[PDB]
CSV table of N, CA, C and O in Angstrom, one decimal:
chain,number,residue,atom,x,y,z
A,216,UNK,N,2.4,20.0,6.3
A,216,UNK,CA,1.5,19.6,5.2
A,216,UNK,C,2.3,18.9,4.1
A,216,UNK,O,2.3,17.7,4.0
A,217,UNK,N,3.0,19.6,3.2
A,217,UNK,CA,3.7,18.9,2.1
A,217,UNK,C,4.6,17.9,2.5
A,217,UNK,O,4.5,16.7,2.1
A,218,UNK,N,5.6,18.2,3.4
A,218,UNK,CA,6.5,17.2,3.8
A,218,UNK,C,5.9,16.0,4.5
A,218,UNK,O,6.4,14.9,4.5
A,219,UNK,N,4.8,16.2,5.2
A,219,UNK,CA,4.1,15.2,6.0
A,219,UNK,C,3.4,14.3,5.0
A,219,UNK,O,3.3,13.1,5.2
A,220,UNK,N,2.8,14.9,4.0
A,220,UNK,CA,2.2,14.1,2.9
A,220,UNK,C,3.3,13.3,2.2
A,220,UNK,O,3.1,12.0,2.1
A,221,UNK,N,4.4,13.8,1.9
A,221,UNK,CA,5.5,13.1,1.3
A,221,UNK,C,6.0,11.9,2.2
A,221,UNK,O,6.2,10.8,1.8
A,222,UNK,N,6.1,12.2,3.5
A,222,UNK,CA,6.6,11.1,4.4
A,222,UNK,C,5.6,10.0,4.5
A,222,UNK,O,6.0,8.8,4.6
A,223,UNK,N,4.3,10.3,4.5
A,223,UNK,CA,3.3,9.3,4.5
A,223,UNK,C,3.3,8.5,3.2
A,223,UNK,O,3.0,7.3,3.2
A,224,UNK,N,3.5,9.1,2.1
A,224,UNK,CA,3.6,8.4,0.8
A,224,UNK,C,4.8,7.4,0.9
A,224,UNK,O,4.7,6.3,0.4
A,225,UNK,N,5.9,7.8,1.5
A,225,UNK,CA,7.1,6.9,1.6
A,225,UNK,C,6.8,5.7,2.5
A,225,UNK,O,7.1,4.6,2.2
A,226,UNK,N,6.1,6.0,3.6
A,226,UNK,CA,5.7,5.0,4.6
A,226,UNK,C,4.8,4.0,3.8
A,226,UNK,O,5.0,2.8,3.9
A,227,UNK,N,3.8,4.5,3.1
A,227,UNK,CA,2.9,3.7,2.3
A,227,UNK,C,3.6,2.8,1.3
A,227,UNK,O,3.4,1.6,1.1
A,228,UNK,N,4.6,3.3,0.5
A,228,UNK,CA,5.3,2.6,-0.5
A,228,UNK,C,6.2,1.5,0.1
A,228,UNK,O,6.2,0.4,-0.5
A,229,UNK,N,6.8,1.7,1.2
A,229,UNK,CA,7.6,0.7,1.9
A,229,UNK,C,6.6,-0.4,2.4
A,229,UNK,O,7.0,-1.5,2.2
A,230,UNK,N,5.5,0.0,2.9
A,230,UNK,CA,4.5,-1.0,3.4
A,230,UNK,C,4.1,-1.8,2.2
A,230,UNK,O,3.9,-3.1,2.3
A,231,UNK,N,3.7,-1.2,1.1
A,231,UNK,CA,3.3,-1.9,-0.1
A,231,UNK,C,4.3,-2.9,-0.7
A,231,UNK,O,4.0,-4.0,-1.1
A,232,UNK,N,5.6,-2.5,-0.7
A,232,UNK,CA,6.7,-3.3,-1.2
A,232,UNK,C,6.9,-4.5,-0.2
A,232,UNK,O,7.0,-5.7,-0.7
A,233,UNK,N,6.8,-4.3,1.1
A,233,UNK,CA,6.8,-5.5,2.0
A,233,UNK,C,5.6,-6.4,1.8
A,233,UNK,O,5.8,-7.6,1.8
A,234,UNK,N,4.4,-5.9,1.6
A,234,UNK,CA,3.3,-6.7,1.3
A,234,UNK,C,3.5,-7.5,0.1
A,234,UNK,O,3.2,-8.7,0.0
A,235,UNK,N,4.1,-6.9,-1.0
A,235,UNK,CA,4.4,-7.6,-2.2
A,235,UNK,C,5.3,-8.8,-2.0
A,235,UNK,O,5.1,-9.9,-2.5
A,236,UNK,N,6.4,-8.6,-1.2
A,236,UNK,CA,7.3,-9.7,-0.8
A,236,UNK,C,6.6,-10.8,0.0
A,236,UNK,O,6.8,-11.9,-0.3
A,237,UNK,N,5.8,-10.4,0.9
A,237,UNK,CA,5.0,-11.4,1.7
A,237,UNK,C,4.1,-12.2,0.9
A,237,UNK,O,4.0,-13.5,1.1
A,238,UNK,N,3.4,-11.6,-0.1
A,238,UNK,CA,2.5,-12.3,-1.0
A,238,UNK,C,3.3,-13.4,-1.7
A,238,UNK,O,2.8,-14.5,-1.9
A,239,UNK,N,4.4,-13.0,-2.3
A,239,UNK,CA,5.3,-13.9,-3.0
A,239,UNK,C,5.7,-15.1,-2.2
A,239,UNK,O,5.6,-16.3,-2.6
A,240,UNK,N,6.2,-14.9,-1.0
A,240,UNK,CA,6.5,-16.0,-0.1
A,240,UNK,C,5.3,-16.9,0.2
A,240,UNK,O,5.4,-18.1,0.0
A,241,UNK,N,4.2,-16.3,0.6
A,241,UNK,CA,3.0,-17.1,0.9
A,241,UNK,C,2.6,-18.0,-0.3
A,241,UNK,O,2.3,-19.2,-0.1
A,242,UNK,N,2.6,-17.4,-1.5
A,242,UNK,CA,2.3,-18.2,-2.7
A,242,UNK,C,3.2,-19.5,-2.7
A,242,UNK,O,2.7,-20.5,-3.0
A,243,UNK,N,4.4,-19.3,-2.4
A,243,UNK,CA,5.4,-20.4,-2.4
A,243,UNK,C,5.1,-21.4,-1.2
A,243,UNK,O,5.1,-22.6,-1.4
A,244,UNK,N,4.7,-20.9,-0.1
A,244,UNK,CA,4.3,-21.7,1.0
A,244,UNK,C,3.0,-22.5,0.7
A,244,UNK,O,3.0,-23.7,1.2
A,245,UNK,N,2.1,-22.0,-0.1
A,245,UNK,CA,0.9,-22.7,-0.4
A,245,UNK,C,1.2,-23.8,-1.3
A,245,UNK,O,0.7,-24.9,-1.1
A,246,UNK,N,2.0,-23.6,-2.3
A,246,UNK,CA,2.4,-24.7,-3.2
A,246,UNK,C,1.3,-25.2,-4.2
A,246,UNK,O,1.2,-26.4,-4.5
A,247,UNK,N,0.6,-24.2,-4.7
A,247,UNK,CA,-0.4,-24.6,-5.7
A,247,UNK,C,0.4,-24.8,-7.0
A,247,UNK,O,1.5,-24.5,-7.1
A,248,UNK,N,-0.4,-25.3,-8.0
A,248,UNK,CA,0.3,-25.5,-9.3
A,248,UNK,C,-0.6,-24.9,-10.4
B,35,UNK,N,-6.5,20.2,-3.7
B,35,UNK,CA,-5.8,19.2,-4.4
B,35,UNK,C,-5.1,18.6,-3.1
B,35,UNK,O,-5.0,17.3,-2.9
B,36,UNK,N,-4.6,19.4,-2.3
B,36,UNK,CA,-3.8,19.0,-1.1
B,36,UNK,C,-4.6,18.1,-0.2
B,36,UNK,O,-4.0,17.1,0.3
B,37,UNK,N,-5.8,18.4,0.1
B,37,UNK,CA,-6.6,17.6,1.0
B,37,UNK,C,-7.1,16.4,0.2
B,37,UNK,O,-7.2,15.3,0.8
B,38,UNK,N,-7.3,16.5,-1.1
B,38,UNK,CA,-7.7,15.3,-1.8
B,38,UNK,C,-6.6,14.2,-1.7
B,38,UNK,O,-6.8,13.0,-1.5
B,39,UNK,N,-5.3,14.6,-1.7
B,39,UNK,CA,-4.2,13.7,-1.7
B,39,UNK,C,-3.8,13.3,-0.2
B,39,UNK,O,-3.4,12.1,0.0
B,40,UNK,N,-4.0,14.1,0.7
B,40,UNK,CA,-3.9,13.7,2.1
B,40,UNK,C,-4.9,12.7,2.5
B,40,UNK,O,-4.6,11.7,3.2
B,41,UNK,N,-6.2,12.8,2.0
B,41,UNK,CA,-7.2,11.9,2.3
B,41,UNK,C,-6.8,10.5,1.6
B,41,UNK,O,-7.0,9.5,2.1
B,42,UNK,N,-6.3,10.6,0.4
B,42,UNK,CA,-6.0,9.4,-0.4
B,42,UNK,C,-4.9,8.7,0.3
B,42,UNK,O,-5.0,7.4,0.3
B,43,UNK,N,-3.9,9.3,0.8
B,43,UNK,CA,-2.8,8.6,1.5
B,43,UNK,C,-3.3,7.9,2.7
B,43,UNK,O,-2.9,6.8,3.0
B,44,UNK,N,-4.2,8.5,3.5
B,44,UNK,CA,-4.8,7.9,4.7
B,44,UNK,C,-5.6,6.7,4.3
B,44,UNK,O,-5.6,5.6,4.9
B,45,UNK,N,-6.4,6.8,3.2
B,45,UNK,CA,-7.2,5.7,2.7
B,45,UNK,C,-6.3,4.5,2.3
B,45,UNK,O,-6.6,3.3,2.6
B,46,UNK,N,-5.2,4.7,1.6
B,46,UNK,CA,-4.3,3.7,1.2
B,46,UNK,C,-3.6,3.1,2.4
B,46,UNK,O,-3.3,1.9,2.4
B,47,UNK,N,-3.1,3.9,3.4
B,47,UNK,CA,-2.5,3.3,4.5
B,47,UNK,C,-3.4,2.4,5.3
B,47,UNK,O,-3.0,1.4,5.9
B,48,UNK,N,-4.7,2.8,5.3
B,48,UNK,CA,-5.7,1.9,6.1
B,48,UNK,C,-5.8,0.6,5.4
B,48,UNK,O,-5.9,-0.5,5.9
B,49,UNK,N,-5.9,0.6,4.0
B,49,UNK,CA,-5.9,-0.6,3.2
B,49,UNK,C,-4.7,-1.4,3.5
B,49,UNK,O,-4.8,-2.7,3.6
B,50,UNK,N,-3.5,-0.8,3.5
B,50,UNK,CA,-2.3,-1.6,3.8
B,50,UNK,C,-2.3,-2.2,5.2
B,50,UNK,O,-1.8,-3.4,5.3
B,51,UNK,N,-2.8,-1.5,6.2
B,51,UNK,CA,-3.0,-2.1,7.5
B,51,UNK,C,-3.9,-3.4,7.5
B,51,UNK,O,-3.5,-4.4,8.0
B,52,UNK,N,-5.1,-3.3,6.8
B,52,UNK,CA,-5.9,-4.5,6.7
B,52,UNK,C,-5.3,-5.6,6.0
B,52,UNK,O,-5.5,-6.8,6.3
B,53,UNK,N,-4.5,-5.3,4.9
B,53,UNK,CA,-3.8,-6.3,4.2
B,53,UNK,C,-2.7,-7.0,5.0
B,53,UNK,O,-2.5,-8.2,4.9
B,54,UNK,N,-2.0,-6.3,5.9
B,54,UNK,CA,-1.0,-6.9,6.8
B,54,UNK,C,-1.7,-7.9,7.7
B,54,UNK,O,-1.1,-8.9,8.0
B,55,UNK,N,-2.9,-7.5,8.2
B,55,UNK,CA,-3.7,-8.4,9.0
B,55,UNK,C,-4.0,-9.7,8.3
B,55,UNK,O,-3.8,-10.7,8.8
B,56,UNK,N,-4.4,-9.6,7.0
B,56,UNK,CA,-4.7,-10.7,6.2
B,56,UNK,C,-3.4,-11.6,6.0
B,56,UNK,O,-3.5,-12.8,6.1
B,57,UNK,N,-2.2,-11.0,5.7
B,57,UNK,CA,-1.0,-11.7,5.6
B,57,UNK,C,-0.8,-12.5,6.9
B,57,UNK,O,-0.4,-13.7,6.8
B,58,UNK,N,-0.9,-11.9,8.1
B,58,UNK,CA,-0.7,-12.7,9.3
B,58,UNK,C,-1.7,-13.8,9.4
B,58,UNK,O,-1.3,-15.0,9.8
B,59,UNK,N,-2.9,-13.6,9.1
B,59,UNK,CA,-3.9,-14.7,9.1
B,59,UNK,C,-3.5,-15.8,8.1
B,59,UNK,O,-3.6,-17.1,8.3
B,60,UNK,N,-3.1,-15.5,6.9
B,60,UNK,CA,-2.8,-16.5,5.9
B,60,UNK,C,-1.5,-17.3,6.3
B,60,UNK,O,-1.5,-18.5,6.0
B,61,UNK,N,-0.6,-16.7,7.0
B,61,UNK,CA,0.6,-17.5,7.5
B,61,UNK,C,0.1,-18.5,8.5
B,61,UNK,O,0.6,-19.6,8.5
B,62,UNK,N,-0.8,-18.1,9.4
B,62,UNK,CA,-1.3,-19.1,10.4
B,62,UNK,C,-2.0,-20.2,9.7
B,62,UNK,O,-1.8,-21.4,9.9
B,63,UNK,N,-2.9,-19.8,8.7
B,63,UNK,CA,-3.6,-20.8,8.0
B,63,UNK,C,-2.8,-21.8,7.2
B,63,UNK,O,-3.2,-23.0,7.1
B,64,UNK,N,-1.6,-21.4,6.6
B,64,UNK,CA,-0.8,-22.3,5.8
B,64,UNK,C,0.2,-23.2,6.7
B,64,UNK,O,0.8,-24.0,6.1
B,65,UNK,N,0.2,-22.9,7.9
B,65,UNK,CA,1.0,-23.8,8.8
B,65,UNK,C,2.2,-23.2,9.5
B,65,UNK,O,2.9,-23.9,10.2
B,66,UNK,N,2.4,-21.9,9.3
B,66,UNK,CA,3.5,-21.2,9.9
B,66,UNK,C,3.3,-20.9,11.4
B,66,UNK,O,2.2,-20.4,11.8
B,67,UNK,N,4.4,-20.8,12.1
B,67,UNK,CA,4.4,-20.5,13.5
C,296,UNK,N,-8.5,-17.1,-0.5
C,296,UNK,CA,-7.9,-16.0,0.2
C,296,UNK,C,-6.5,-15.7,-0.4
C,296,UNK,O,-6.2,-14.4,-0.5
C,297,UNK,N,-5.8,-16.6,-0.9
C,297,UNK,CA,-4.4,-16.3,-1.4
C,297,UNK,C,-4.6,-15.4,-2.7
C,297,UNK,O,-4.0,-14.4,-2.8
C,298,UNK,N,-5.4,-15.8,-3.7
C,298,UNK,CA,-5.6,-15.0,-4.9
C,298,UNK,C,-6.2,-13.7,-4.5
C,298,UNK,O,-5.8,-12.7,-5.1
C,299,UNK,N,-7.2,-13.6,-3.6
C,299,UNK,CA,-7.8,-12.3,-3.3
C,299,UNK,C,-6.8,-11.4,-2.7
C,299,UNK,O,-6.7,-10.2,-3.1
C,300,UNK,N,-5.9,-11.9,-1.9
C,300,UNK,CA,-4.8,-11.1,-1.3
C,300,UNK,C,-3.9,-10.6,-2.4
C,300,UNK,O,-3.5,-9.4,-2.4
C,301,UNK,N,-3.5,-11.5,-3.3
C,301,UNK,CA,-2.5,-11.1,-4.3
C,301,UNK,C,-3.1,-9.9,-5.1
C,301,UNK,O,-2.4,-8.9,-5.4
C,302,UNK,N,-4.4,-10.0,-5.5
C,302,UNK,CA,-5.1,-9.0,-6.3
C,302,UNK,C,-5.2,-7.7,-5.5
C,302,UNK,O,-4.9,-6.6,-6.1
C,303,UNK,N,-5.5,-7.7,-4.2
C,303,UNK,CA,-5.6,-6.5,-3.5
C,303,UNK,C,-4.2,-5.8,-3.3
C,303,UNK,O,-4.2,-4.6,-3.3
C,304,UNK,N,-3.1,-6.6,-3.2
C,304,UNK,CA,-1.8,-6.1,-3.0
C,304,UNK,C,-1.3,-5.4,-4.3
C,304,UNK,O,-0.8,-4.3,-4.4
C,305,UNK,N,-1.7,-6.0,-5.5
C,305,UNK,CA,-1.4,-5.4,-6.8
C,305,UNK,C,-2.2,-4.1,-7.0
C,305,UNK,O,-1.6,-3.1,-7.5
C,306,UNK,N,-3.4,-4.0,-6.5
C,306,UNK,CA,-4.2,-2.8,-6.6
C,306,UNK,C,-3.6,-1.7,-5.7
C,306,UNK,O,-3.4,-0.6,-6.1
C,307,UNK,N,-3.1,-2.1,-4.5
C,307,UNK,CA,-2.5,-1.2,-3.6
C,307,UNK,C,-1.3,-0.6,-4.2
C,307,UNK,O,-1.0,0.6,-4.1
C,308,UNK,N,-0.4,-1.4,-4.8
C,308,UNK,CA,0.8,-0.9,-5.4
C,308,UNK,C,0.5,0.1,-6.5
C,308,UNK,O,1.1,1.2,-6.6
C,309,UNK,N,-0.4,-0.3,-7.4
C,309,UNK,CA,-0.8,0.6,-8.5
C,309,UNK,C,-1.3,1.9,-8.0
C,309,UNK,O,-0.8,3.0,-8.5
C,310,UNK,N,-2.2,1.9,-7.1
C,310,UNK,CA,-2.7,3.1,-6.5
C,310,UNK,C,-1.7,4.0,-5.8
C,310,UNK,O,-1.7,5.2,-5.9
C,311,UNK,N,-0.8,3.3,-5.0
C,311,UNK,CA,0.3,4.1,-4.3
C,311,UNK,C,1.3,4.7,-5.4
C,311,UNK,O,1.7,5.8,-5.1
C,312,UNK,N,1.6,4.0,-6.4
C,312,UNK,CA,2.5,4.6,-7.4
C,312,UNK,C,1.8,5.8,-8.1
C,312,UNK,O,2.5,6.8,-8.3
C,313,UNK,N,0.6,5.7,-8.4
C,313,UNK,CA,-0.2,6.8,-9.0
C,313,UNK,C,-0.2,8.0,-8.0
C,313,UNK,O,0.0,9.2,-8.4
C,314,UNK,N,-0.5,7.7,-6.8
C,314,UNK,CA,-0.5,8.7,-5.7
C,314,UNK,C,0.9,9.4,-5.6
C,314,UNK,O,1.0,10.6,-5.5
C,315,UNK,N,1.9,8.7,-5.6
C,315,UNK,CA,3.3,9.2,-5.6
C,315,UNK,C,3.5,10.2,-6.8
C,315,UNK,O,4.0,11.3,-6.5
C,316,UNK,N,3.1,9.9,-7.9
C,316,UNK,CA,3.2,10.8,-9.1
C,316,UNK,C,2.4,12.1,-8.8
C,316,UNK,O,2.9,13.2,-9.1
C,317,UNK,N,1.2,12.0,-8.3
C,317,UNK,CA,0.3,13.1,-8.0
C,317,UNK,C,0.9,14.0,-6.9
C,317,UNK,O,0.8,15.2,-7.1
C,318,UNK,N,1.5,13.4,-5.9
C,318,UNK,CA,2.1,14.2,-4.8
C,318,UNK,C,3.3,14.9,-5.4
C,318,UNK,O,3.5,16.1,-5.0
C,319,UNK,N,4.1,14.3,-6.3
C,319,UNK,CA,5.3,15.0,-6.8
C,319,UNK,C,4.8,16.2,-7.7
C,319,UNK,O,5.5,17.2,-7.7
C,320,UNK,N,3.7,16.0,-8.5
C,320,UNK,CA,3.1,17.1,-9.3
C,320,UNK,C,2.6,18.2,-8.3
C,320,UNK,O,2.9,19.4,-8.6
C,321,UNK,N,2.0,17.9,-7.2
C,321,UNK,CA,1.6,18.9,-6.2
C,321,UNK,C,2.7,19.6,-5.6
C,321,UNK,O,2.8,20.9,-5.4
C,322,UNK,N,3.9,19.0,-5.3
C,322,UNK,CA,5.0,19.6,-4.7
C,322,UNK,C,5.6,20.7,-5.7
C,322,UNK,O,6.1,21.7,-5.2
C,323,UNK,N,5.5,20.5,-7.0
C,323,UNK,CA,6.0,21.5,-7.9
C,323,UNK,C,5.2,22.8,-7.7
C,323,UNK,O,5.7,23.9,-7.8
C,324,UNK,N,3.9,22.7,-7.5
C,324,UNK,CA,3.0,23.8,-7.3
C,324,UNK,C,3.2,24.4,-5.9
C,324,UNK,O,3.2,25.7,-5.8
C,325,UNK,N,3.4,23.7,-4.9
C,325,UNK,CA,3.5,24.3,-3.5
C,325,UNK,C,4.9,24.6,-3.0
C,325,UNK,O,5.2,25.5,-2.3
C,326,UNK,N,5.9,23.8,-3.6
C,326,UNK,CA,7.3,24.0,-3.3
C,326,UNK,C,7.6,23.6,-1.8
C,326,UNK,O,6.8,22.8,-1.2
C,327,UNK,N,8.6,24.1,-1.3
C,327,UNK,CA,9.1,23.8,0.1
């Protein structure tokens, strides 16, 4: 229970940080102004 | 409180999964691969 | 789609950091 919840939070946070990096790259690939 | 937060982490992980799907779609759309 | 995605990713991050704080407060209560 507690440790499992903590591990899922860490899984979630790394996923979110990778999503944040992908969004930044994509914005650069789109090349809007 | 424990099941409220267990449910919350599953809800956010599901959101992250659908956002990863969207990142893969946007890379295909912008010309990548 | 690009802006919609950026906004959803910002909401995800915000929600996940708030959840992390909540989980740490719960860990103080349940220990382990």
